[PDB]
Every structure is written in C-alpha cells, then in structure tokens.
Symmetry: C3
Subunit: 275 residues, 3 copies
Amino acid sequence: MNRQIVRSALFVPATRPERIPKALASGADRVIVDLEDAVEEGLKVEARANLRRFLVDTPEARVLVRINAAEHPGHADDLALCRDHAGVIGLLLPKVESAAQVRHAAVASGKPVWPIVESARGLAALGEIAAAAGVERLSFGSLDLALDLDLNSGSNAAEQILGHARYALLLQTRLAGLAPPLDGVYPAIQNRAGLVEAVRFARDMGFGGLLCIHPSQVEPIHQTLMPSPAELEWARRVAEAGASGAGVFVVDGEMVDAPVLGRARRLLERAGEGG
Amino acid sequence: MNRQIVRSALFVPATRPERIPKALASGADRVIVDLEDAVEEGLKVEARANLRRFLVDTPEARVLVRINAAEHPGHADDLALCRDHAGVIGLLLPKVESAAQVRHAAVASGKPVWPIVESARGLAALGEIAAAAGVERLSFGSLDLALDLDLNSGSNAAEQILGHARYALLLQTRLAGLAPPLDGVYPAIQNRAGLVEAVRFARDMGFGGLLCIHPSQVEPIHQTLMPSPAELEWARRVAEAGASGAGVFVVDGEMVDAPVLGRARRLLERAGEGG
Amino acid sequence: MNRQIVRSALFVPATRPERIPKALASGADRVIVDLEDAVEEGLKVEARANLRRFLVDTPEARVLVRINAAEHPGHADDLALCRDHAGVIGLLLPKVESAAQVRHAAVASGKPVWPIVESARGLAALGEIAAAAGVERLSFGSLDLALDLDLNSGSNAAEQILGHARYALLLQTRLAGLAPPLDGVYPAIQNRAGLVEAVRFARDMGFGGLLCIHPSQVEPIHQTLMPSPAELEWARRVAEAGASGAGVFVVDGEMVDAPVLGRARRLLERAGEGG
Ligand SMILES: CC(=O)SCCNC(=O)CCNC(=O)[C@H](O)C(C)(C)COP(=O)(O)OP(=O)(O)OC[C@H]1O[C@@H](n2cnc3c(N)ncnc32)[C@H](O)[C@@H]1OP(=O)(O)O
Ligand SMILES: CC(=O)SCCNC(=O)CCNC(=O)[C@H](O)C(C)(C)COP(=O)(O)OP(=O)(O)OC[C@H]1O[C@@H](n2cnc3c(N)ncnc32)[C@H](O)[C@@H]1OP(=O)(O)O
Ligand SMILES: CC(=O)SCCNC(=O)CCNC(=O)[C@H](O)C(C)(C)COP(=O)(O)OP(=O)(O)OC[C@H]1O[C@@H](n2cnc3c(N)ncnc32)[C@H](O)[C@@H]1OP(=O)(O)O
C-alpha cells in the first residue's frame, strides 16, 4: 500500500454531510467519514446514503471510511460502498480481533484496511492482525481500550496502560513492515497546549500522526510534527561530522556512532532536502 | 465464581488467631488467613491448628486462606483444611508458575483459587494461569516480584517494572474473563497519604482493590475507591446529554462518543443507582 | 558461564589499538574491543589485524570482542579470531534476531555469547535468544533500538519504549537463568551527573551494570552501583530484627515479611560480608 506518513486523520460522521467538505479543507492528510460509533443505529442507513451522495457529487474527493464491523447487519452494505466508489481509498476496521476479520474486509472492499486496536482481544491477536494481508497501518481506539480495560481516561495510570498497547502497535508496525501508525484521539478539542503535548509524545515514540476529531486540531498537529530548527541544526551538524567518514565521534558532548548518524540522516531527508 | 469487586483483602497470620476476629470486624471485603510467608517454618503446624480451631469455633465466618505452595511439605495439609471447612471460601495460591498448579489446588480444595503472581515464571505463564479452571481473580505479589527480579523496592525504576507486570495481570484478567484483580500490599502501615495514592493509581489502571496488611488501611482504601462527587457529577451530565441518543456531543470541552458514554453509565451504575 | 556481575563493559574500537591498554587500565570489569559499528567498512580487515596483534602481544589480556553479524562478509573471520586467542573470553553478537544466530556464534567461536538486543525483531524473539545454548548474559543496544523504532533518543516517550525493551531483557534473564544483564550506553561523556542517574535507574531495575564508551565513565558507574550507607544500614536493621526468627515485624514503619528479609540479606551479602 501507501507507506507514507499520515500526520492527521480527521473523523467526520456521515450524519454530517455538510461537514465532510469542511473536513477536507482542514488540510488533514486523511479524512475519515464514519458510519459506526458516531452514527446512531437508526441513522446508519441514511448516513450511508449521505456518504454515497457525497462521493458521487465529489469524484475528486478521496476519503477513508470507518465501517461497521462484521457483528453489525449493515457490514456488507458498508463494504459495498467502500468497494464501489474510487474516492474510498481505505477503510478503518473497528473492534478488530483477528487476521481473518482483516482479510474479509480487505477482499470484499478491494481496499486497504487500517485495523483499529480497541480491545484487550485485539492486542492479544495483534501479531496476526498486523501481519494480515491488506493492512496498511495501525491506529488505536484510546477511549475504547479505556472502556474495555476499565481505565479512568486521562489519568497517570491509564496512560501507563495505554503505553503498553502503544508499544505493541509500534512493535508490530516494524515487524510486519507497515506504514507509520497513528496514535488515538485527543478529545479536548480547544486545549491546543494539551494537544501539542500528546502529539509530541506520539512522534517521539515513533508514531507518524494522530487520529483527529476537529479541523482546529489539524494545524497544531502538523506544526508540532515538523522538526524544530534545533533538531534540524543538530542533524546537520551530526551529518557534517560523519562526512569525513569517521566511525565514531562527539557532537554535543555526546558520542555519535553509526546508529546516531543514521538518525540524523533520516531526519534530514524525511523532512527537507536529503543528501 | 464470584465476579464481584473485592476492594480490600486483609492479611492476618495464623500465628495470631486472636487477630482473626479483629481482621473481620475491620470491614475488609475479604480477610486472608496466612499459612505461608508470615508464619515462620517452626510455627506452621501449630498455625494451621490455630486456623482449624478458629473455623470450627466461628461457623458464620468466611475467610480466604493463603496456603504454602506445593514445594512445601505441608501443602497437602493446607489443602485439606481449605477443603474441609465451609468458612474457607477460596485460597490464595502463592508463587504460581503453571496452570497445572492452579488445577491441583482447585480440584483438591474444591474451592476457588486466587493465584498470586509473584515471579518472572508466573508472568511468563500468566495466559495459562489466568485461564485455568477454578480461577476467580488474580492478585499481585509486589514484594516477592521485587525479590525475584532484584528490584530496589520503592524506586522509580522498580515501579516501572512493576507496571509491566501489573499490565499482564490486567490484560489477562480481561482475556480470561476473571473478576477484578487486586494490586499488591502497601507496607507503610501509617502513611495514609501514600496508601491513598497507591489505591487511586491501582483503581485508575483497572484494579478492583488492594491486598492490605493492617485493619487501619481498610477505610482509606474503601474511601479512595468510591467515585468522587465530581466523577459522579460528570457521569450524570454525560449520561444526561446522551439520553436522546445522539452519536457524538461535547461535555467538558471534550468529545463524548459511544465508548465515553459507556464509561459514564458503568460508573453511575457500578457505584450507585443505575439507569 | 560466569554468573557474576559485570559492572562495566568499556567499548574501544579495533582501529585504535593504542587505546585498548588504556581501556584495561580503566578498571572496567570488562573491556569490549569492537569490530562492528565503530569500525568503518574500509578499516575492518586492518582493525581485525590490529586486534590479533594486540592479543598475541598481550597474552595476559582478557577482552570481549564485538563481531560483525552473520550478514557481514567478515563474520567467519571475526569468529575465527575469537576462537583462536585465549584472550577473547566472549563475544558481543549485535543485531541478534534468532536463537540460531546465537548457536552459530557460540558453536563457531566456542566462547560465551552476549547477545545485544538492538531491534524490534530481536525483542520479539527474545525468549528464544536468551534460552539459546551459549548465552552468558544479555545487553541492550539503546541507540540501535531508537533507530529501528524511530525513537527520539533522550525524550520522555522514547525512554518509556526503551523501558519495555529493558523489561523483556530483565524478564528473559530470570526465565533463562542468565548472568545479570547490562543497560545500554550513556553517550554524554562528561555529564557524570546524568551518567550517575542512568546508572542508578538501571540498578534499581535489576541490571548489574552498564555498557560504557569512555574510561572516565568507569568510576562513576562503580561508585553508583555500590549500596549507600543508608541502604546497608537499612538491611542491617531489618536483618537484625529478623534474627530471632519472627515471621512478620515492623522496621521503618514498614511491614517486613519473608520477601523483604531476603532483600535485606541479599544486599548485605552481594555487597559486603554475608551471614
Ligand atoms: C473514537 C473517536 O474519537 S472518532 C469516532 C467519532 N468521531 C467523530 O466523528 C467526532 C468528530 N467531531 C465532531 O463530530 C464534532 O467536532 C463534535 C460533534 C465532537 C463537536 O462539534 P461542535 O461542538 O458542534 O462544533 P463547534 O461548535 O466546535 O464548531 C465546529 C465547526 O467546525 C466544523 N466541524 C466540527 N467538527 C468537524 C469535523 N469532524 N469535520 C469537519 N468539520 C467539522 C463545523 O461544521 C463548524 O463549522 P461552521 O462554524 O462553519 O459550521
Ligand atoms: C502482604 C504480605 O506480606 S502477606 C502478610 C501476611 N501476614 C501479615 O503480615 C498480616 C498483616 N500484618 C500483620 O500481621 C501486622 O499488621 C504486623 C505484624 C505487620 C504489625 O503488627 P503490630 O505492629 O504489632 O500492630 P499494631 O500495634 O499497629 O496493631 C494495632 C491493633 O491492630 C491489630 N492488628 C494488627 N495487625 C492486624 C491484622 N493483620 N489483623 C487484625 N488486627 C490486626 C492489633 O491486634 C491491634 O489491636 P489491639 O490494639 O486491640 O491489640
Ligand atoms: C553501537 C555502538 O557503536 S556503541 C559505541 C561503540 N564504541 C565506541 O563508541 C568506542 C568507544 N569510544 C571512543 O572511541 C571514544 O571514547 C570517543 C571516540 C567517543 C571519544 O574519543 P576522544 O574524543 O578522542 O577522547 P578524549 O578527547 O576524551 O580523550 C580520550 C582519552 O582517553 C582515552 N580513551 C578514549 N576513549 C577510550 C576508550 N574507549 N578506551 C580506552 N581509552 C580511551 C584516549 O586514549 C585518551 O587518553 P590520552 O589522552 O592519554 O590519549
């Protein structure tokens, strides 16, 4: 699939057809139109039709869709919508607990699957799931695993438990060679100072971006994701001293060996001019 | 077994039978009579006889018993005592390292087993152990595990190791469908401010209660475990706004989706009047 | 192998053979002569010859060698140097990802193996790796792991991930019964206060020592590893109060049972006179 970084994946429910155009103008790397836990049961059918009309009327629009899982009766109608419009470039599979769930949603949709880890069962099967055919990258339901594991969302201890799940998304991402994963949603819409901290914590940990819920969150996320002038100046000074060809040296009073030089070069290239 | 919350399980050694009544009058949700690591080798036979006599003289009493593990020569005598008195409603199995150890303790006692995860070996086999037939809930031997892993008890690094072990107790609890687990003992008897912090950290992470070692600890634990006026006031207001049935709303500047609504309803009902 | 503690293992590259003697006079418990990530490709053959010349010229010297992994063309020549000189008392195997690589390095060198956990693949196979025949102890490549997992070395988040890696080295050490492992390198050569903190965090967590990269790091590490007067005074008083033979008692306002007594006795003996 696409092995590129998604810095922002903005959720917008299909009950809000007028806010899907707003989502795409946010500047979000991806927009997720939702048909599942933001859409009330009675509106799922009408919400699916709202999305179909949006894709039809907007052929150049390319979106991701969080479908309902196989336990739901609308599953197949959700998969058919993902398969039949070119604007659907992938789907979020919620409540994923098996590689077989990934393969069925992938084959029936013909589109790449972003498995969402939202439960204890998901974590335990995550080897299978990340390695399953059709997987592009992983994302995580932070508020969902707090329910499933009985966490007091927002607390020190809760973030420590979530740190273990994040570790598994990050570990399995490398083992299965997936594209960079996206950390969960920061629900305090207007708290940009808290949002900035959750974004920098995620990047420092190896995540590529964040699942967003508001367009106001897009610029804070993308701005916090770019390397600082310092980090780029460090990477430059580290790359400059490894041109000589020395095996090991010191840059900021810190030893620099091959792996550190490799970190500076990947920073210099992933974000700016390489070489 | 019982899928109810045990907020506190108060240890009292079987060498001090005049303290068993005091333990029960504490209000601890469970009292554990100890035959293992608080009874010196030389007093274990007499201590068992103290416990046998207390059970006979106190038919309405219901206690949990921590026996010696199968390596011990008194193992079989401990099991018979747990099997032969109705007042014994379960047994703590220390140093558990295999599902076969749980099964032998459950079949021979005919009572529910509380495994204590006290060793690296226990953790590695915790899948087997938590799924063994007879398991009611897991509990955490924090001081045995510091011994086993050469930890400096009380330190930042040690608690970080203990956090990974706690996660496996919490993960397997959900995977095996067990009753809520108990975090380890807080040994600073009179330091209630530290006890309160350890109790709120454990609850926030998904534990149901604490192993305790003094009756003076019980009220701090049950008082720290009840939802605050604010948390209940929060749950009421998120439940209030999701009554109509809308998919996603905002409560405290924070997004409220189905999983958050589910947390507030479980709080309002798990502790208080539901509906 | 040796089930003793290595407090410090001082890296020195085989390109600077004049520094190998300095490494030995450092007092480091072990010296590592490097043929991998500090020796540039173009210098590896000559560096191999530098190490051979040092070993022949210094029959009494006892060193560890960090060889190139099996993917490297010099792999077999490196193992041959380890096998043919008595001064080579073990080898560091970098980029370890399978038990079979351990067995090939062990059998071909005939010397004990220190696997370095430097990658996600390594972590996932760490059960196999630690249990393989030939392993003496595990060590941790913190800077390789930051590259492999895209970590911002030095940040709060990266340290949390590395804690998950560290946990698995420590768990697998206990499960496979290996000698005590060594935490990764602290690269800020002159920041002794930061080094001292990295050393104490590692010890509190169960490491026996640290991989080091400069001889000035050796004395800070060895002084920070020794128990403080306070810690020894604590163990003495808990050991003194448990001499009578009581099962449970109070020492510093803290309950003391069998597991706590064992920590106090192990502290007094592992560092000082036992009994
Ligand atoms: C598990 C998860 O967290 S994802 C599961 C489901 N998640 C979602 O779909 C939630 C996504 N976000 C939202 O639905 C909304 O932000 C809400 C309902 C939470 C809150 O929205 P409101 O409080 O009504 O919006 P607010 O008063 O801040 O104003 C929002 C403005 O941005 C727009 N907007 C708000 N949310 C979105 C969105 N997700 N996508 C696009 N535009 C949006 C609105 O149209 C409005 O623009 P306008 O003034 O021109 O009409
Ligand atoms: C987690 C583990 O390590 S498993 C522990 C297995 N056994 C235990 O350690 C049980 C818990 N600990 C104890 O036995 C005790 O609390 C001790 C030995 C650690 C401390 O005992 P002391 O320091 O003598 O207690 P202290 O003087 O504070 O006791 C005050 C009152 O509490 C009572 N009390 C103390 N511990 C207990 C107990 N476990 N159960 C019931 N009552 C108790 C005393 O009898 C006393 O009542 P009294 O004044 O009417 O006589
Ligand atoms: C995965 C990895 O690659 S982890 C790292 C691998 N291993 C290494 O990094 C090799 C070990 N480190 C070193 O090579 C050095 O410490 C360096 C290159 C980082 C710094 O070296 P320099 O900046 O030249 O040293 P500095 O200016 O501090 O002076 C060093 C002094 O101690 C000695 N010294 C320095 N490093 C070492 C060493 N590793 N072993 C022994 N002696 C050493 C030097 O001989 C010198 O003493 P001198 O003045 O009598 O000649």
